[PDB]
Nucleic acid binder design. Sequence first.
RNA 1: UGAUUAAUAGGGACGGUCGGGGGCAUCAGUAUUCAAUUGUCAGAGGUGAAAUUCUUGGAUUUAUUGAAGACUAACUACUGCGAAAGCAUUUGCCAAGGACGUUUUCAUUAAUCAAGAACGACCAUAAACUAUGCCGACUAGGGAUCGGGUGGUGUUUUUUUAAUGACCCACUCGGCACCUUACGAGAACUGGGGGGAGUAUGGUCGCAAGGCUGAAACUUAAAGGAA
Lengths: 134, 211, 157, 127
Amino acid sequence: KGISSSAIPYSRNAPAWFKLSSESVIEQIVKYARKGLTPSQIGVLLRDAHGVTQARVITGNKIMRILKSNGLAPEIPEDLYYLIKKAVSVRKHLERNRKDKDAKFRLILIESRIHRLARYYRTVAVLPPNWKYE
Amino acid sequence: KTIWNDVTRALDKHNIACVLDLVEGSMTVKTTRKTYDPAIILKARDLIKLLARSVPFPQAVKILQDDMACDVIKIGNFVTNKERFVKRRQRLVGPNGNTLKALELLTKCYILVQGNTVSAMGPFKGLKEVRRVVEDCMKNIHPIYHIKELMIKRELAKRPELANEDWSRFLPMFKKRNVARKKPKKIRNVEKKVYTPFPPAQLPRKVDLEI
Amino acid sequence: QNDLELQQFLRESHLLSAFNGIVYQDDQVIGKARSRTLEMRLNRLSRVNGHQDKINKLEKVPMHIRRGMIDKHVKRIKKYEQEAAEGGIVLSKVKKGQFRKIESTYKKDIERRIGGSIKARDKEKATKRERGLKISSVGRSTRNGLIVSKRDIARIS
Amino acid sequence: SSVLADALNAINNAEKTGKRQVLLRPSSKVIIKFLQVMQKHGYIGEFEYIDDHRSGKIVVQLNGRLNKCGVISPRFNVKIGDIEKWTANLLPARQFGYVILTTSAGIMDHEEARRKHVSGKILGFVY
RNA sequence: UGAUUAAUAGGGACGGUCGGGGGCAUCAGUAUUCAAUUGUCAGAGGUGAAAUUCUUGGAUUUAUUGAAGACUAACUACUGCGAAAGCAUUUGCCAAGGACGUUUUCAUUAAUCAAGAACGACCAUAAACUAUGCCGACUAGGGAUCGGGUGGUGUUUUUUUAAUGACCCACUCGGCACCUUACGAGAACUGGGGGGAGUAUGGUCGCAAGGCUGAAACUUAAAGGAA
């Protein structure tokens, strides 16, 4: 078990080399989301391309809340979606070749980690009940 | 670097040149013009490869004399798990080195258990003895059984008669141990518990059952 | 395990090899191997019933030369097993405080003067940890805290 | 574990190991009241709350005087009468150390709880 | 349309990657066994000695060639990977995993284990066997090593095809280990009598001695043992 995070800094202002506007950043967020990126990809392309550190700091709020205010809300939340697509990629590989028991054990682990935050997102009810995981 | 003058003297009485190249870390033996023995360069080859395999020098220049030979028994490829492998190799070395020193005495050989191989020097009867002992110790039969058989066979070789009778009626290594042959039903184990790649679903919790 | 000749030859194979087919059976073992084989056997038979304080008496050796013998002998043991472990060589296993028995041990007869282990350190190792003084009994003391059982809460309050 | 419990575990075994400063994160108001009352009675010295925006850190400088802190994991109720049987039952002697209660007037040691005549639940001890 | 952080808790994305992790396919190696073609000629195996066995229809050895099955030597380490059992030829594909980097995202989703779930009529085989150490909530370290990252500025490098290095030194995060350190209640596939080493026996339960056989109702042959 290791410790590799990003250290979110002690300052909560714009860094004052940021000469831009806080509205052009939101227009850039809705542009990238309309052209089709997940909020992690939105934030990383924003971090590296046009020097906004973090949109909660510079803009008003966090960027899934920006997409919810501009009508681009994700159908299934991003963590659950990526674990869905990973679990179905492993299930495709397993139906392909059926002696990868390491892939079967990893499928068990991915399905359990599907169930845990499907439970969390159902009891907070971001996604509705009678959500089955196919 | 300290024992090198003694290797040079021990080979120069046999007319073989030898160099120690520390900038690569090598040792070469070379037949000179005055070398009148053809097969002495192979014993010098054994000598430098023993000094590389880290036997001592006074135990190493016993290879330049005719009744002696090297051997490197290979034991890495006998068993699967590392626990069983290291326990059988420590069974070969023995409690406080007793099994190894007793085998050295009984076969008149010099044995080094090193890594996953077992080096040995000595006479040829001793080398065949130690090879079958080491391979039988890497299979399951204990080396003290072979050492008991060696003591028995030594005492039977030092009598004048009984020199053309088979000694299997003396040896205890014949034990008649083949007493496993099961009679279980194979009721399921013929073809049952068929394999699927997909696991079934999980039993959900209480609050999952209420949502 | 109950073959006496075999185990005797096994455990005396070191000093036979230090003071030498080969002769191993009594009625054939000449002087110094004979005296030390007999001394070894008598100590091993004697250790079962005799007192541990009185079976292994060490020779009265002065302090500055018994410490010197031990320091040089441990330097020999360190050189031996460090060289043999930087080569691939597999050595038989010692316990934690014991001196490894090597060729110089059997040849110099060093255990009569230095012993098999430093029994002062073995004593202060095998003693138990001194554990303070006990204070309360109202609950169990785990890393989450002091669990006070509900019977005790009713009994006190 | 809990979150007051491991702060008190750090402040216990750092002092038993014999250090003169402990850094304990995360910090909270319950820890600040607990350290506040134990420095009132003199078992730690100065202590500082470094504010990073995550949870806060504490640096406690501690001299020699403590030998056990802790919490009482079932936070039962006590009354102003039964504080006496409780301090006698879980402290080492008659007038040795204090039992820290969560009261209606804050967090206080048991002798100030009877001094200003309040009750509460138990929180932990210090002696 | 109408409240917080962003835990050196957790989850997910991303980046360069890391590994003898796994699956399928492919490529290779010399061995062993068989066969074929020569060459030559009485032995060859094997053993402590022999023997079974092969052999002038030519064994064994040598040379060329071909196939079949198994394995992946040396490099192989107190190293690497995997949940464990385990995993070593090349190359490709398929998914996966880990640490690290991050001024990315979600916002308590978390830890623990009774239950349960996954992995673990034909040719026949081993397993353990001398071993060890003081335990956990717990402090500093030290040298080495593996993976990632940051900085330093010298040598191997090199250049205007796209990158990708190796080494040295410091720092740092995380691993399999090793050598020391300081400080703590550490209690509230089943079936069992109680030490070690002996000693003694008018009890109970068994074994156990005779004494030349022949040969006893028969003082009895022949042959033998014993001297």
